[PDB]
């Protein structure tokens, strides 16, 4: 079925870009967006932004857009989230959502959750 | 007698214009060949301030150029007649075009029986024009010989390159897509120019059907496209839209 | 900025009984109609899932117990009958306009 | 050449392939044919109605 | 000489057809007499897929067929001269529609004019809805449209008559903060919207203004009434009658 | 036939009574018109420049 | 032979009119010369009950009332030929009109194009719009219209000239979220919007490059401005003029 | 006569000074154009088979 596979925990020092990846597996790529959604230590869903793998179009909550850059690979079907001056406010879990639009069924299956621990 | 028909043999070029400008009353569209033959619509086309394969894709397409250029009769006497020639200029040349077709897309489901049926109004030519979309919601303006599009930017609107994700949401913020709206469910079938959309829910039967084959596919509650090399009519209840065009016999 | 209000904060339900959780909008999330609320459930561990779609519908694979409700700026969430196995954080997320919101969500732990 | 893309999840199909030439100004010519004149008279009077029915336009 | 009129007689067929591809540059609407005549017309309807009573319709209605047909270049040469003429097929036929006219709506302050004047027909139990004015033609009570840029809308369209917003449809709208008063010339009749100060008589030729419009929309058939002045335009709700040339 | 109803309550008239007939497909037909040549040379040479100026359109 | 010609001759004019009714099938328009000479059509024009400087007005646009009036087959025959000439009645006349051109107006990030461009005209103290580019047809400094498919708006739509948001009448819009670049060639000059990283500049003919835009919308007169390069459009504000041919 | 104003406020230009003629209604008239007959019969053919056409068109 509709799979989304992510990558594993990391462990960063503050100040480094540091990139997540989540490889969808089962649909059409073209058809959807691959919404980025992180979830702070016992927080909300906190939103990040989106973006639109047919032209890549990216966009974002206006508090996110100096701290992640979203890309796509439309060839390997992958999601990319690079973030960028990591503090210790980031150290969170990064989810990426298929989220069917248009009078929407959205965010049908989720992926498995990157863990950023941003620390010295 | 035969001084008549000379008259009529020596200006052919002139007696047809002045009856296609009587017909059209002054001002006269598409350009025949009567009012420019090939040579000097050539020679016209070599004379524009335009780059070279400009002027090569006009002198390929002599007869959409034809089909866009008016022509507006400015004096004329007993010796002589006279009538501008506007022929168009394209600023822009080789950027990539599409034309959208839509359809109604319900969305069908019996869980709770809440249905409503979208469909896009914005179907039409699109076009790259300098970095940005050039629109052309009108049938009439743009024009297609077999991998070329001639639009014209009289009326044309301009929207962002950011459309295309309308073509794969309604609401993408990234540009609000022209869209109305339905409470229940209704099913047509579009044709396209490579093939058709099949629209059927509710309690509509619509069925595929290959000229030798017969039936081939019965649509559920979707929308479905299909080729016009696999289907060749689609029955959505009574109307039989056809995807392809019937031939029929020739007359001599 | 639709931010939503979601409430209770921790819901307690006895074994076998109906929940409900409201999502009141700030604005109206409704568009040509239909609102775009998502009911979403999230166990410790795991991804949200989806539950509820469009404020009414069902997902795909979603037992009934599981039901949506409201319109304008009032939306409701049901669960009836209770079991075990249902207990998490549930959300509601808006879909409107940019940028979507998620609510507070509420945890439901059995009473 | 013309690929036809279909996303069901709007239910519009999409004609790429295809390259453009917007018209964006004019080119205007000023043609002028002389009439080849003939020194019979009914053909002569048609053209010459013709051409004052032409200039009242005007 | 008489060879050059031979010429010009027996292929007048040929010569016609080069004309209006030369003037119309190799596509041509509506399909001529010279492009495809009744015989050879009537031949190609009993050769169609079309059901017999659509083959009777459109033996019945060749006007608006040729008006609606066109006729593309092909393949030109000395000797042959070969032209694809794209027939109208109809999918649909003998079900009810109806033409929408629309005049401005004012109330004590905002005026309202649902701005979707066009026609519909019933299709599928939909309505297919026509907003242009050359997709569909009318003869002496049928309605031959096109479904190339027919919009699809349910059949809850007839609540947008008794209610300008009923529950079940949502009608187009163009609002308006001041009051405006004009005419509408319907087909067997007009619709005459007088307010404001605008004082707005209907007359008929024959016995002068008979009938003054206060502050309202008013309703006027073309069977006693002529003309219709609405502040200082005269609207004409039936065609004048005029000379006679020869 | 025709009947006209008038609504008050949207400032409309609905023109009912008609039938339909919506076009769908296109039904497609080769006609080939041959030239029935004689053996006036001025004439013959007026036909070829127009089939010639007809052909260079394709 | 002689008769032939005779035929031809003395009845070019029927001739003429059973040819374009054969092409155009039974509906012809514009009504041309040989289906109504001057001599006839200015017979018509007094004969319409009309005010006198409407006569004065119709007689010297006898092109634009020729292309706007139509010419309806009614019966046909062997011996005599009739049809049904709809000439234009034009019901107020000598108002104000203006033509509305409109760009992208980019603020920063919006973008606002006003899609309510077209002709307007003072009807009968509110203002009929047309947004057709058929509708209407101008001569030196005259608009003709019809108020047939035609959009009453109240007076107060000037306003929308100088405000968006106007509360006296409010102006429909389309919105973009990106800046984008395009020009309008209008009828005394041109409109350029530039915005972006889109590089445009505004060429006189015989001078080269002469202005170059900021990040703006500005407007160039025809009498100095001959092109303007948007990215890598050009827009011709005049029209170029080219060799003439015999 | 004709001037355009130029609104930089939401960048639209008005051509202002025009004078209008609105056409609200139709003038009909009944042309009966005849035909001058000759008693050479491929030309009377010809125009009777354009009269039949023409007749089975309506």
């Known amino acids: 079925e509709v799979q989304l596979q992510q990558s594993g925990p990391e462990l960063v020092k503050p100040g480094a870009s540091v990139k997540i990846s989540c490889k969808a597996s089962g649909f059409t790529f073209t058809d959807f967006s691959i919404h980025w959604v992180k979830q702070s230590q016992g927080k909300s869903l906190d939103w990040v932004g989106y973006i639109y793998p047919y032209t890549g179009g990216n966009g974002y909550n206006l508090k996110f857009q100096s701290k992640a850059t979203l890309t796509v690979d439309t060839s390997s079907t992958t999601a990319y989230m690079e973030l960028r001056s990591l503090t210790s406010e980031d150290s969170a879990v990064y989810y990426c959502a298929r989220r069917e639009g248009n009078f929407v069924g959205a965010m049908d299956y989720w992926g498995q959750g990157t863990s950023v621990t941003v620390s010295s | 007698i035969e001084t008549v028909i000379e008259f009529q043999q020596k200006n052919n070029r002139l007696l047809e ?48 150029v034809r089909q866009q250029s008016y022509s507006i009769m400015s004096i004329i006497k007993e010796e002589v007649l006279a009538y501008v020639v506007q022929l168009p200029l394209y600023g822009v040349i ?11 897309l319900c969305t069908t489901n019996t869980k709770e029986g809440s249905n409503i049926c979208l469909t896009r109004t914005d179907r039409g030519w699109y076009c790259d024009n300098a970095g940005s979309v050039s629109f052309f919601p009108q049938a009439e303006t743009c024009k297609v010989q077999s991998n070329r599009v001639f639009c014209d930017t009289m009326n044309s609107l301009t929207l962002p390159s950011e459309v295309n994700l309308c073509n794969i949401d309604i609401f993408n913020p990234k540009y609000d897509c022209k869209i109305m709206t339905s409470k229940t469910d209704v099913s047509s079938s579009v044709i396209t120019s490579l093939g058709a959309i099949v629209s059927c829910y509710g309690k509509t039967k619509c069925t595929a059907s290959n000229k030798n084959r017969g039936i081939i ?31 029929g016999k020739s007359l001599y | 900025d639709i931010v939503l209000t979601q409430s209770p904060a921790s ?13 009141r909008a700030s604005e109206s999330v409704d568009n040509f109609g239909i609102s775009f609320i998502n009911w979403f459930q999230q166990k410790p561990g795991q991804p ?57 969500g509420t945890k439901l732990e059995i009473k | ?51 004052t029915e032409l200039q009242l336009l005007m």
Request: proline share 4%; with cysteine; aromatic share 10%.
């Open chain 2, 17 to 64: 214009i002045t009856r296609e400008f009587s017909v059209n009353a002054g001002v006269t569209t598409p350009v025949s060949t009567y009012m420019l033959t090939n040579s000097e619509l050539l020679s016209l086309i070599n004379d524009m301030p335009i780059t070279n394969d400009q002027k090569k894709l006009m002198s390929n397409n002599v007869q959409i």
């Open chain 4, 1 to 51: 050449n013309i690929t036809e893309e279909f996303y069901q999840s709007t239910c519009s199909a999409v004609s790429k392939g295809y390259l453009s030439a917007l018209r964006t100004g004019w080119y205007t010519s000023v043609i002028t044919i002389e009439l080849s004149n003939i020194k019979i008279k009914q053909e002569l009077d048609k053209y010459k109605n013709a051409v």
């Open chain 2, 217 to 247: 596919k019965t649509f559920s509650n979707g929308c479905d496209y299909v080729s016009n090399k696999g289907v060749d009519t689609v029955s959505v209840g009574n109307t039989l839209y056809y995807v392809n065009k019937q031939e």
């Open chain 3, 11 to 23: 819901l307690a339900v006895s074994l076998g009984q109906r929940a409900t959780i409201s999502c």
């Open chain 3, 48 to 104: 949200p899932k989806l539950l509820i779609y469009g404020a009414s519908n069902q997902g795909s694979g979603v037992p009934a117990r599981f039901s949506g409700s409201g319109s304008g700026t009032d939306f409701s969430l049901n669960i009836h009958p209770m079991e075990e196995v249902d207990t998490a954080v549930y959300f509601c997320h808006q879909s409107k306009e940019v940028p979507y919101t998620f609510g507070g």
């Open chain 2, 94 to 104: 080789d950027t990539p075009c599409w034309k959208l077709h839509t359809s109604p």
